[PDB]
A paper describes a structure:
CRISPR-Cas systems are prokaryotic adaptive immune systems and phages use anti-CRISPR proteins (Acrs) to counteract these systems. In the type I-F system, after pre-crRNA is transcribed, Cas6f processes the pre-crRNA into small crRNAs, binds it, and further assembles with one Cas8f, one Cas5f, and six Cas7f proteins to generate the crRNA-guided surveillance complex (Csy complex). AcrIF24 targets the Cas7f subunits by engaging up to five Cas7f subunits (Cas7.2f-7.6 f), sterically blocks access to the crRNA guide by the complementary target DNA, and induces non-sequence-specific DNA binding to the Csy complex. AcrIF24 forms a homodimer and further induces dimerization of the Csy complex.
During the process of structure determination, we found that the residues ranging from 73 to 135 of AcrIF24 tend to be disordered, with electronic density too weak to model the structure of this region. Therefore, we made another AcrIF24 construct (AcrIF24 Δmiddle domain, short for AcrIF24ΔMD hereafter) by deleting this region and linking the remaining two parts of the protein with a “GSGSSG” linker. We solved its crystal structure to a resolution of 2.10 Å. There is only one AcrIF24ΔMD molecule in the asymmetric unit. The structure of AcrIF24ΔMD revealed a two-domain architecture, with an extended N-terminal domain (residues 1–72, NTD) and a globular C-terminal domain (residues 136–228, CTD). The NTD comprises a five-stranded antiparallel β sheet and a bent α helix. The CTD comprises five α helices and a single 310 helix. In the structure, the two helices ranging from residue 181–198 of AcrIF24CTD (colored orange), almost perpendicular to each other, constitute an HTH motif, linked by the characteristic sharp turn (residues 189–191). In the crystal, two AcrIF24 protomers with twofold symmetry interact with each other with several hydrophobic interactions from their CTDs, extending to a length of ~113 Å. The results showed that mutating F212/H216/Y217 to either alanines or glutamates changed AcrIF24ΔMD to monomers as indicated by the assays of gel filtration chromatography.
Numbering used by the authors:
A (entry chain A), B (entry chain A): 1 to 71, 137 to 228
């Protein structure tokens, strides 16, 4: 496979390839989480960066539509895509973000463009310690960001004021 | 002794008492950290709350003078009393606040009036865990608040915007 992950978006190749014009091909699907966004059949000689370029315009259109739909700090529209329980200031009913929810706001392909190391620096923590927030393959056994650090990070990123 | 601590202020009794009007007396000194603020000789039958009431007006005058001198969030003037290294957003040159600096902003006698348990709730942590930030008698071996939690707390208290 070797799926391509661009923030909260993913591009996945089909299990079984195809053949077109005497060359191997593959059907790639672009998803926003579970939501199927687009499909394109592309040659096998394509680098992953070439596939990312192929789907970048659909991603940018997603961003434009979300900016208009969820119109405050400059990136407040991102809060329209996050569940209320990760945004609430009631710590008793708050829950930490999932990896996908975090990748909405951290990562070069995130909607903020801020890398993991830069976000770690914004929180005063090492990049290796911040990497744990998206590490592993177990949601339940994955390091969770703290309430205070999450809301502080959302303030520093211009997504939601801590107020 | 049994000194009285009111946020960053302390009232200390003299080692050797005195006698006035056939009754035991003690000379109490009110300090703001190391700064001697006032002296009053008061009877031994005074409760600690009575001594606190005796010095409360001088404390309130301190607050008025600081509010005027360090005039933004409503309690921004408190930042005039805190060293720059605990206020800086450069995590590489930041240092955590001391217990005294923390008691500027947390505690019923602090300049915010917000209790330790309420501040803990503002940070999403238990009161017992927050108590560790002012526990013990060793500055070096005292639990330190994190960069993100400290700046988030200062934002939630109305002392300094996280921006």
């Amino acid at each position: 496979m070797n799926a391509i992950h661009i923030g909260p978006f993913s591009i996945t190749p089909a299990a079984r390839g195809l053949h077109y014009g005497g060359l191997p091909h593959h059907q790639w699907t672009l998803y926003y989480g579970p939501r199927e966004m687009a499909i394109k059949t592309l040659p096998d000689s394509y680098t992953s960066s070439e596939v990312r370029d192929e789907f970048s315009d659909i991603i940018a259109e997603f961003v434009i539509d979300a900016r208009h739909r969820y119109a405050a700090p400059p990136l407040a529209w991102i809060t329209g895509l996050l569940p209320g329980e990760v945004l609430t200031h009631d710590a008793e009913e708050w829950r930490p973000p999932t990896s996908w929810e975090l990748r909405h706001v951290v990562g070069e392909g995130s909607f903020t463009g801020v890398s993991g190391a830069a976000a770690a620096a914004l929180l005063g923590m090492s990049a290796t310690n911040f990497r744990k927030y998206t590490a592993g393959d177990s949601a339940a056994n994955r390091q969770k960001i703290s309430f205070a650090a999450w809301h502080y990070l959302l303030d520093r990123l211009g997504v939601k004021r801590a107020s």
